[PDB]
């Protein structure tokens, strides 16, 4: 007998439940329609604590407070940006958010498996810019191994997990203050 997709999703979430925090190392690539304007495969990290996360990827350091506010520093533009992201925008930068909070918006189904892995498919009940989310997990213990988000326009955001570890994440990792970026331009997008 084998678990439902919902069952596998809730077994995968257990791997991110360390109370003091979880560190995820990954590689990610965005493949744009017709491969025009794609972003190359590169490396990143996510620190999770409760509903908060700190994302390091590309030129960006981003923090989500677990409520409604995303703050991110872009080292290439020298801007500190504060915004109210949509639920879809959060999944696009942190696909594992589908595991850390209750989500009312997606139908769940099992997709064809891989060698030693399972594949869970999530499709929105209401249009939201996302066509499908695909979470890859290890067949032994449902440990997340990767994710792919396909946008309605065909963009593929592909994430490969290269490590999951324990960490003691302090309050300070989930805040960005203007003093920490000499000369930074603050842009309030709220």
Residue numbers in the entry: 0, 27 to 215
Question: What's written in the study?
Answer:
The IM complex LolCDE extracts lipoproteins from the membrane and moves them to the chaperone LolA. The LolA-lipoprotein complex crosses the periplasm after which the lipoprotein is anchored to the OM. In γ-proteobacteria anchoring is assisted by the receptor LolB, while a corresponding protein has not been identified in other phyla.
The structure of LolA-PG was solved using single anomalous dispersion (SAD) on selenomethionine (SeMet) labelled protein whereas the structure of LolA-VC was determined with molecular replacement using a model obtained from Alphafold22. LolA from both P. gingivalis and V. cholerae consist of a large curved β-sheet comprising twelve β-strands. In LolA-PG the cleft is continuous and relatively open (36 Å3) as compared to the scattered cleft in Lol-VC which is occluded and only expose 0.15 Å3. The equivalent loop in LolA-PG is well ordered, probably due to stabilizing crystal contacts. The Arg-Pro motif is not present in LolA-PG or in LolA-BU. Instead, they both have a glycine located at the corresponding position (Gly75 in LolA-PG). The equivalent space of the arginine side chain is instead filled with the hydrophobic Leu41 in LolA-PG (Phe43 in LolA-BU). It should be added that when the sequence analysis was extended to include LolA also from other classes of proteobacteria it is established that the Arg-Pro motif is also found in β-proteobacteria (Neisseria meningitidis) but not ε-proteobacteria (Helicobacter pylori), hence the motif is not universal even among proteobacteria. Furthermore, there is a difference in the theoretical isoelectric point for the two proteins in this study, 4.8 for LolA-VC and 9.3 for LolA-PG calculated on the mature proteins. We investigated this hypothesis experimentally by ITC and could conclude that LolA from both V. cholerae and P. gingivalis bind polymyxin B. LolA-PG shows higher affinity for polymyxin with a Kd of 14 µM compared with 56 µM for LolA-VC.
